[PDB]
Amino acid sequence: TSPRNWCIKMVCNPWFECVSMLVILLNCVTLGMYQPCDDMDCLSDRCKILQVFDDFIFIFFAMEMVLKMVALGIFGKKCYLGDTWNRLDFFIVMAGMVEYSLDLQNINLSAIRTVRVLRPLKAINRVPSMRILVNLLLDTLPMLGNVLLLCFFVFFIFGIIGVQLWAGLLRNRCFLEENFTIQGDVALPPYYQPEEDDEMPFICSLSGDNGIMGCHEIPPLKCVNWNRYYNVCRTGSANPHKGAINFDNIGYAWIVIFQVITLEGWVEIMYYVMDAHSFYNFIYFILLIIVGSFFMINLCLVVIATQFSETKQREHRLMLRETRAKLRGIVDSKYFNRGIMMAILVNTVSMGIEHHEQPEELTNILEICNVVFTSMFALEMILKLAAFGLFDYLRNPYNIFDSIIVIISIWEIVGQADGGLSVLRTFRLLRVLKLVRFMPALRRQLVVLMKTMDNVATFCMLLMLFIFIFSILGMHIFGCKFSLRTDTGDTVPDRKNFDSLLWAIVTVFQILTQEDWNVVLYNGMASTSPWASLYFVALMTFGNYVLFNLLVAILVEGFQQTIIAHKLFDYVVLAFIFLNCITIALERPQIEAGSTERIFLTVSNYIFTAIFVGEMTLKVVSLGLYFGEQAYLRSSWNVLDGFLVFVSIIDIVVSLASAGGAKILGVLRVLRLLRTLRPLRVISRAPGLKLVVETLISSLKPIGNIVLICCAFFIIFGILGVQLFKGKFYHCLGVDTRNITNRSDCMAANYRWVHHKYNFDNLGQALMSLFVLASKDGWVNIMYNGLDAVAVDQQPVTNHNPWMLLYFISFLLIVSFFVLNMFVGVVVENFHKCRQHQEAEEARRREEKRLRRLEKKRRKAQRLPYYATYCHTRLLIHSMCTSHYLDIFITFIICLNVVTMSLEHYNQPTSLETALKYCNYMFTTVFVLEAVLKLVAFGLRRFFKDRWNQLDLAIVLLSVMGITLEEIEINAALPINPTIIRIMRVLRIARVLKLLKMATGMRALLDTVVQALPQVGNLGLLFMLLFFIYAALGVELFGKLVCNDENPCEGMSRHATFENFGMAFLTLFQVSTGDNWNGIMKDTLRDCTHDERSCLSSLQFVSPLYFVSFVLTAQFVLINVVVAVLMKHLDDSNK
């Protein structure tokens, strides 16, 4: 109409969208200036003027809303409320309206002011690339419901188990005697806490509960052993971590299960449970990690990638002067280019040399070397501008880059006064970048990287919007609430606080990286209220398991003589290895020399070596070593076996030379190390593992380019880190650690000059620290040491140099992107391979698939026995009583049962327990009722043919057994061990599995997993084998690292040490998960007090290599498991 026609021109003007986006950004800026720790009551100039800007923004929002409705109409597909984000704009408009109205009413209500945080979210529709990406993501969400209901299963089952088992156990610290006698001066705390004010508790075990720590393992204080008086322990006070980790409710159990889903702070709470209740809870925690933490979130990645692929396909288908030439010859000589390559390589080698307290002569050598190299590069500059000419030089901008290097280098040489020495040295790294102009494959690889970034840009902008929104929200609800109490006289804020928007963003990024996010969780959820964990859950989930899987999907979709017998020899030699491996699983460095076990191990090694050399001889006489083709050494695995047997012979010969053991000890160490590799012949002597290892190696080459690029970035950033930090990572750890500046002041107080173990002195330690950063573990501590570092030899101060965040976050982001593109590379390769075959086999299956269609045509009607069940008092059971309306009843009763076990908690009112008992009776009776109905519906033919009614039978049998045993303790007929009742309550959870019948989508998803078990099982066997090899190596290497008070460990706490074999197999399982593995490495490389040669040994050279190789191999094996599942998923989606 005419009134609409007045404003359609303005509202449809792209200028209107431009000014809209501009006011969105200005609103974001006004939000950013919030200072919760400083902005109390808004009694300042900045506060009032920002309130004025927010008023203006609200005015503009109301104006744009009203014009858009009057010009587009209301409540219709073409009207204003047609598109989602128009409705969202409506929502924030009304929210601001009510906020302003309540502000007029003089009501503070800092619970609706927090709604402002949704305002930046309006920009999502004002950028078309963002619009289309978010539209696709929203459209691909609704197919994600299946994995989320799987999430509900694997949270609810374990939460019920936990609340039934460990309810309230966490509380029970260790108290004093009942009628205790003290002369006076009451300093004895009510219970015992080893560290001040209960951040590390001493959870005991009640009498009657078989815990492991039972209040007689307390440390004797070091006079008067006051601690020994802590005799008995009863419940009370608070659960551990400021009342944040417990299993009392089911909400708390869900919080804890979420924490161990993120694989952070895991062994801490596992050891709480072990302290309190039983030693056998590692089964509970490991079964959760394997299922809940790996087969769950990676199923989310698989489902998101697959569904996004098909939604992209769907939307796509919807559309459906003379010597110049002479000198030119020397330039492209194919020998001069390699000469300047060698020049640049030795230049970067020279650059990496410098370190802390470098030799006085060496720095002069380096500076003259720099002069030589810049002179050579300038010579190349002049010769190339001469033989080519000014225009020919500028034709390729790589020449421009080289000229830039030349000019900055000569400027650095000239700039010897000030300023230049601080920065122009730091630009020397660009000289390394000249290699790309030479190496060919590293041109196409970077080109395809840029092709990816072409689309990754919009996702990156989306990510920063998301992180900004959540940082604003956190800074609201947690603002100035993390004030850590006094420690040296003042309440120093936690470094992870939310007080300033800079710290808000860096803390939200920290949490997104899942490193020390539990510290923030506890320190926040004990500040506001226990419901504050929903914020962390929403952040971590919506970010990590949705947006990032979206990024992965974006990349993946973007890239589109004598007699010889060989009948059963392999199985028997595999048996012999099993035996050898259980001979290898016992050499703990604690068996006393000359014991029965030592002798048994020696003789077992003797016979096993005899058997293996015998089979080696058999094979070689069958084939021959290298005498022509098809010999013994024409295959890799035979070469490996020969290598192992040769090392075995060397070891036995040297061992028999034990006399004169001086100077050969290192040889013995190396020979033991190479012994531990012997459990690797299974791959050769088993077909599936052999094929899988070949497939791994084959998939390893197409990602080689990215690996080399990532290693180059590691070297570049390592040299950069050496440049920035030289010897700044020294801090005066003492009783005061205050009012002291430099080493001289520290020695004045005589405390100590402690040296951090993760530093940037050398380039090797630079690479170690960079690997720690890149693996998202313990990187916050390194970042704190980086920001705090002040100068060469004095105390770091808190946040001295907040600019290093750029380095410490840019490294994480770049390394993370390279790792993501490495995965995406594995998938593409594998798909290409299978797709090439696939169709061939599947064609024949489709020829058989129509036969299966013909098979169902046979199935039409074999006179089903409904009539025999008709008129026999059950004409209604078989037909009217087996309808879906009778199964909605069963599902509803299942949900009521779920929500009624979801109500148990510690110290519940007795009335609630009685009501739950009555509800259990109700539900058992009804389950019996439809069990009998189903049994009368049909005889025993289909009763054993359903394969699912048996599940109902088992459940009803468990339920009736449970209700029957309840009577036994009503009448006290027989003394029943409460363990039986425990098992029965905890097993009542089996009534949940009845939902699987209706959830056909979950059935399909779990199936798609199930027909991946060839590859998945072979990879799992490989993974166990890798743990075995690395555990044996670790036991041999770090076996004797004593952990006591005088050697305070950081990561190997109680059973995570390497002493035994299994105790090391656990710590390998812990390192693989990436929880406090950096702590374990710091524990190993630890100079001791000359108590042992292991501490003084070559640990520094070999411990980091051990840990890095293990972490890389474990992660790669897991990636290959995931890609196998994903390919089978795409194949199933094809059919």
Ligand X SMILES: CC(C)CCC[C@@H](C)[C@H]1CC[C@H]2[C@@H]3CC=C4C[C@@H](OC(=O)CCC(=O)O)CC[C@]4(C)[C@H]3CC[C@@]12C
Ligand Y SMILES: O=c1[nH]c2ccccc2n1C1CCN(CCCC(c2ccc(F)cc2)c2ccc(F)cc2)CC1
Ligand Z SMILES: CCCCCCCCCCCCCCCCCC(=O)OC[C@H](COP(=O)(O)OCCN)OC(=O)CCCCCCCCCCCCCCCCC
Ligand U SMILES: *[C@@H]1O[C@H](CO)[C@@H](O)[C@H](O)[C@H]1NC(C)=O
Question: How near is the Cβ of 1112 to ligand Z at its closest, in Å?
Answer: 4
Question: With contact defined as beta carbons under 8 Å apart, do 922 and 1026 qualify?
Answer: no
Q: Which residues from 27-56 bind ligand X, rule CB under 6 A? A: 28-29, 32-33, 35
Which CB sits closer to ligand Y, 253 or 554?
Answer: 554
Binding-residue pattern over the window 681 to 700 for ligand Z, x denoting contact by CB under 6 A: ---------------x----
Binders of ligand Z in range 9-68 (CB under 6 A): none
- Cβ proximity to ligand Z: between 291 and 995 the closer is 291
CA–CA dist 165, 969 (Å, integer): 19
Question: Would you say 638 or 1073 has its CB closer to Ca ion?
Answer: 1073
Q: What is the distance between the alpha carbons of residues 991 and 993, in angstroms, rounded to a whole number?
A: 6
Minimum CB separation of residue 556 from ligand Y in Å reads 8
Nearer to ligand Z, 775 or 794 (CB): 775
Taking CB under 6 A as the rule, which mask of x and - marks residues 747-776 in contact with ligand Z? ---------------------------xxx
| One-letter amino acid of 534 | L
Could you say which of 260, 512, 767, 1029 contacts ligand Y (CB under 6 A)? 512
Q: Which residues pair with 794 in a beta bridge?
A: 742
In the range 1076-1115, which residues lie near ligand Z by CB under 6 A? 1108-1109, 1111-1113, 1115
Stretch that binds ligand Y, among 38-46, 464-472, 512-520, 929-937 (CB under 6 A): 512-520
Take residue 814 and report the two structure tokens written for it.
């770049």
Q: What is the DSSP letter of 997?
A: G
Task: Pick between residue 98 and residue 653 the one whose CB is nearest to ligand X.
Answer: 98
Q: Which residue has the tokens 């998923």?
A: 1129
Residue 286 binding partner per list ligand U, ligand X, ligand Y, none, with a CB distance cut-off of 5 to 8 Å that depends on partner kind: ligand X
Please list every residue from 744 through 783 that binds Ca ion, using CB under 5 A: 777
As a three-state string, the secondary structure of 751-762 is: CCCEECCCCCCC
Find the binding residues for ligand Y in span 812-831 (CB under 6 A). Answer: 812, 816, 819-820, 823-824
794: phi then psi, degrees, rounded to nearest 5: -150, 175
Contact present, 53 and 24 (Cβ < 8 Å): no
Give the residue from 1026, 1036, 985 showing the smallest Cα distance to 1115. 1026
Give the nearest distance from C-beta 805 to ligand X in angstroms.
13
Q: In whole angstroms, how far apart are CA 779 and each of 236, 758, 812, 813, 1113?
A: 36, 10, 9, 13, 21
Q: Which does 1115 bind (CB under 5 to 8 A by kind): ligand Y, ligand U, ligand X, none?
A: ligand Y
Contact 1068, 1110 (CB under 8 A): yes
Question: Binding partner of residue 739 among Ca ion, ligand Y, ligand U, none, CB under 5 to 8 Å per kind?
Answer: ligand U
Q: Which of 159, 211, 1074, 1104 binds Ca ion (CB under 5 A)?
A: 1074
Q: Would you give the binding string for ligand Y spanning residues 548-567, x where CB under 6 A is met?
A: x---x---------------
DSSP letter for 486, please: P
> What is the token pair recorded at 136?
């696709």
- Please list every residue from 709 through 728 that binds ligand Z, using CB under 6 A: 710-711
Q: Is 221 in the site for ligand Z (CB under 6 A)?
A: no
Residue 841 has phi, psi (to 5 degrees) of -60, -50
Helices 636-656 and 665-675 pack at an angle, to 10 degrees, of 140
Instruction: Select the binding partner of residue 1074 from ligand Y, Ca ion, ligand U, none (C-beta < 5 to 8 A, by kind).
Output: Ca ion
Which one among 146, 246, 278, 507 touches ligand X, defined by CB under 6 A? 278
Which residue number, 548 or 637, has a Cβ lying nearer to ligand Y? Answer: 548
Dihedral over alpha carbons 125, 130, 136, 142 (to 10 degrees): -60
Residue 957 burial (CB count, 10 A): 11
138 contributes a contact to ligand X by CB under 6 A: no
Residue 416 interacts with ligand U (CB under 6 A)? no
For residues 1040 and 804, what is the distance between their CA atoms, to the nearest angstrom? 39
Identified binder of ligand X from the candidate list 202, 771, 818, 923, rule CB under 6 A: 771
Contact between 61 and ligand X per CB under 6 A: no
| Token duo for residue 95 | 């929210």
> Which residues have a Cβ under 8 Å from the Cβ of 124 and sit 6 or more positions away?
85, 130, 131, 134, 462, 465
Considering the rule CB under 6 A, would residue 1116 count as an interface residue with ligand Z? yes
Minimum gap (Å) between residue 804 Cβ and ligand U: 24
Give the total of residues touching ligand Z (CB under 6 A).
18
1115 is a contact residue toward ligand Y (CB under 6 A)? yes
Name the segment binding ligand U (CB under 6 A); options: 343-351, 574-582, 738-746, 828-836.
738-746
Binding-site string for ligand Y from residue 421 to residue 440, where x marks contact by CB under 6 A and - marks none:
--------------------
Q: Are 441 and 702 in contact (CB under 8 A)?
A: no
**DSSP annotation string for 427-471:** GGGGGGGGGGGT-SHHHHHHHHHHHHHHHHHHHHHHHHHHHHHHH
For residue 972, which amino acid is it?
A
Helices (H) and strands (E) in the chain, counts: 42, 2
- Pick 732 or 772: Cβ nearer ligand Y: 772
Closer by beta carbon to ligand U, 518 or else 794: 794
**Measured from the CB of residue 570, what is the shortest distance to ligand Z in angstroms?**
22
Using DSSP's 3-state secondary structure scheme, residue 936 falls into: helix
Residues followed by a gap in the chain, C→N > 2.5 Å: 222, 320, 560
Tokens found for residue 1077: 């593995």
Q: Which of 69, 144, 449, 819 binds ligand Z (CB under 6 A)?
A: 819
Decide: 86 and 92 in contact? Cβ < 8 Å: no
Tokens representing 968 are 């036994």
Query: Looking only at residues 1101 through 1130 of this chain, which bind ligand X when binding is defined by CB under 6 A?
Result: 1101, 1104-1105, 1108
Phi, psi of 38 (to 5 degrees): -115, -30
Binding mask 740-759 for ligand U (x = CB under 6 A): -xx-xx--------------
Q: 368, 534, 733, 915: which one contacts ligand X (CB under 6 A)?
A: 534
In the list ligand Z, ligand U, Ca ion, none, the entry touching 790 (Cβ below 5 to 8 angstroms by class) is none
196: DSSP letter:
T
Tokens of 611: 């058997």
What DSSP character marks residue 189? -
Contact letters for ligand Z, residues 1033-1072 (x by CB under 6 A): ----------------------------------------
Query: Pick from ligand X, Ca ion, ligand U, none: which does 741 bind, CB < 5 to 8 A by kind?
Result: ligand U
Site for ligand X in 695-724 (CB under 6 A): 711, 714-715
Whole-angstrom distance, CA of residue 1030 vs CA of residue 468? 42
Q: Which amino acid is at 319?
A: M
Residue 707 touching ligand Z (CB under 6 A): yes
Note whether 1055 binds ligand X by CB under 6 A: yes
The residues that bridge with 742 in the sheet, in sequence order, are 794
Residues in the chain: 1135
Which does residue 582 touch among ligand Y, Ca ion, ligand X, none (CB within 5 to 8 A, set by kind)?
ligand X
d(CA 519, CA 504): 15
Among residues 650, 577, 657, the alpha carbon closest in space to that of 612 is found at: 577
**Minimal distance in Å, beta carbon 576 to ligand Z?**
24
Q: Are 1125 and 1016 in contact (CB under 8 A)?
A: yes
Number of shown-chain residues binding ligand X (CB under 6 A): 72
Binding site for ligand Y (CB under 6 A): 298, 512-514, 544, 548, 552, 776, 812, 816, 819-820, 823-824, 1115, 1118-1119, 1122
The residues binding ligand U (CB under 6 A) are 736, 738-739, 741-742, 744-745
Give residues in contact with Ca ion (CB under 5 A): 777, 1074
- Residues lying near ligand Z in the complex (CB under 6 A): 696, 707, 710-711, 774-776, 815, 819, 822, 1074, 1108-1109, 1111-1113, 1115-1116
